């Protein structure tokens, strides 16, 4: 109910909400191009299959977690150390596994993988990668918020919160990658031994 | 003759860091960080964004005279607004 004795700017139209799903407001000076995406940041669209990205903190879509990092790489393989065993380095010839045997004999030599050992280690490594990446939980979220100029205390609280969680997750992501790469390489050296 | 136990070696140049060692070459690694974007603003899930361009949210909803192209209100996948819009 509207009532006025003056100074009223009345609506002519109202806006019915017809669809209420999640979206968000993105701040950018670019324009729409004739392309498609499942995840969009202010700097451009991303086509991803990995758990983390370093493009921008804000995004609209089903996206990887943002970290403040240039590099997160998980070793899955062996230290690539280029007639001699693990002491010297890797026999170049083997492509059928990770760990294996030379088998020299009088019928003829030839390298072959140890399938039992490689397969157990292989599943160990794939389970490890999955434990590392499946623990990241993201969701569609309109992350950005706007505050007025009289809400500096709240804006700063919000920013601190977001920066705080970014530091925690960047730390956890980098630390986990480094701790796991150390163990991955020890794991592989242990398995050859 | 002898049987040797060894491991794979490759021509991979991919390197990783560990807590106590840095710049270590490995035969395989999984890069788990996405470092690229295409630089374009696209249609999210096949549905275009609302393109306000020069218009602000208040401009759009109130009907700024210069935002007369937004009166058609199509379905949005996201709202695209310039930082510090004019209209």
């Amino acid at each position, epitope marked *: 109910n509207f009532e006025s004795t003056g100074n009223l700017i009345a609506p002519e139209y109202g806006f019915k909400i017809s669809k209420r799903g999640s979206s968000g407001i993105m701040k950018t000076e*670019g324009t729409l191009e004739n392309c498609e995406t499942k995840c969009q940041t202010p700097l451009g669209a991303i086509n991803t299959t990995l758990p983390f990205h370093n493009v921008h903190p804000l995004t609209i879509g089903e996206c990887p977690k943002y970290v403040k990092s240039e590099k997160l790489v998980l070793a899955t393989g062996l230290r690539n150390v280029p007639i001699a065993g693990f002491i010297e380095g890797g026999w170049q010839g083997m492509v059928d596994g990770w760990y294996g045997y030379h088998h020299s004999n009088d019928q003829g030599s030839g390298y072959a993988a140890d399938k039992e050992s490689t397969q157990k280690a292989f599943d160990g490594i794939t389970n490890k990668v999955n434990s590392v990446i499946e623990k990241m939980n993201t969701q569609f979220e309109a992350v950005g918020k706007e505050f007025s100029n009289l809400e500096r205390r709240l804006e700063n609280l919000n920013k601190k919160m977001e920066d705080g969680f970014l530091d925690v997750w960047t730390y956890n992501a980098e630390l986990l990658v480094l701790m796991e790469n150390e163990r991955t390489l020890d794991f592989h050296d242990s398995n050859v031994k | 003759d002898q049987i040797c136990i060894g491991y794979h070696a490759n021509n991979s140049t991919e390197k990783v860091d560990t807590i106590l060692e840095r710049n270590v070459t490995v035969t395989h690694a999984k890069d788990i960080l996405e470092k690229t974007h295409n630089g374009k603003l696209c249609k999210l899930n096949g549905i275009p964004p609302l393109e306000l361009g020069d218009c602000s949210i208040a401009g759009w909803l109130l009907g700024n005279p210069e935002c007369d192209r937004l009166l058609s209100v199509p379905e949005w996948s996201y709202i695209m607004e310039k930082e510090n819009p004019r209209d």
Partner: antibody
Amino acid sequence: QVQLRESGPGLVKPSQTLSLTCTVSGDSISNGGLYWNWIRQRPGRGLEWIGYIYYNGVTTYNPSLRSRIAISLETAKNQLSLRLSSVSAADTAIYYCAREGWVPDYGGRNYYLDFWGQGTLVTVSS
Amino acid sequence: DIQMTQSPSSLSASVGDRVTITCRASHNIQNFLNWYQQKPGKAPKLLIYAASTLQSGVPSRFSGSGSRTDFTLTISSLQPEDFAAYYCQQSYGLPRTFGQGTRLEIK
């Protein structure tokens, strides 16, 4: 390692088209995922940003040149080029190409220009 | 778009003196300010990026800091070699802009 080198006609007459080419060396133009920029200095005046191109064809420009400017790249030769139509005395400047790198940050990638070329002077006269 | 105001327009200082140059943005540029040093005859060199980080190879006498809308370049222990115009660059938006350039003379 990364160097940028530039060349062009030197002299452009009024109302002609100015065309400059930057050759990127030691940095694959199509693989870095970096933005390539054009910047210029008119006599007396300070640095003015012209525009940039992504490793792909997405291109942005300084709005003051929107009626006159085009930027493009040829991946095959690691080259960038700048084209300005309706060139006049105001366009006399030292032109420079530069590479845009970044720092991941709390607000998103924080961009800066590390590698610059030597630049070249274009004179506009009759 | 976002304009940059740089001040002083010029400085004069002796060898061993410390000076400051500042940047003021018309809008919030959130730690996206870069500083450049331009010696005559050369393309500008990056000194400071992301408000306070020095570029590799930049002498330790250079430093700076700042926050939304206000940043400072500090040059301590000025040497005869630190003769240059210094520029403010705002990387926050797409239509990237620069300040006017501060001309610092060394005695």
